Design a binder for this molecule. Structure first.
Ligand SMILES: *[C@@H]1O[C@H](CO)[C@@H](O)[C@H](O)[C@H]1NC(C)=O
Ligand SMILES: *[C@@H]1O[C@H](CO)[C@@H](O)[C@H](O)[C@H]1NC(C)=O
Lengths: 50, 57
């Protein structure tokens, strides 16, 4: 395991889908909001959908 | 452009991700986008431009 800052791991996930890494850094707060809000929907999905 | 910015503590360099090979940071092995305000954790350092000394010829 090599440590790396998490926002730099995500940039090297983004380059792997062909989106240029500056698209992450110019939108990092927005991406954190979308990711955090998306896991909120998982808890609601599992809590509602037995 | 490809690789990671890294520092030993005072020198700044860029390397490929999978084997340490420290290049000097330049207008060739980097690309610009936007102003310094937006990015979290950006650092102040000089980026070299190889054309400059040739126009100083
Ligand atoms: C990294 O963590 C330190 C506290 O240990 C904090 O002062 C610093 O602002 C953080 N840097 C970034 C880029 O978030
Ligand atoms: C980076 O450089 C600019 C221009 O000299 C300066 O305004 C800014 O305060 C510097 N940032 C840091 C973290 O020192």
């Amino acid at each position: 395991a090599l440590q790396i800052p998490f926002a730099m791991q995500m940039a090297y996930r983004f380059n792997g889908i062909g989106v240029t890494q500056n698209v992450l850094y110019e939108n990092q707060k927005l991406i954190a909001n979308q990711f955090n809000s998306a896991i909120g929907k998982i808890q609601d999905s599992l809590s509602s959908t037995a | 452009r490809e690789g990671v910015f890294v520092s030993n503590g005072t020198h700044w360099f860029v390397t490929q991700r999978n084997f340490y090979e420290p290049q000097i940071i330049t207008t060739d092995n980097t690309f610009v986008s936007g102003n310094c305000d937006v990015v979290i954790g950006i650092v102040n350092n000089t980026v070299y431009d190889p054309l400059q000394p040739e126009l100083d010829s």
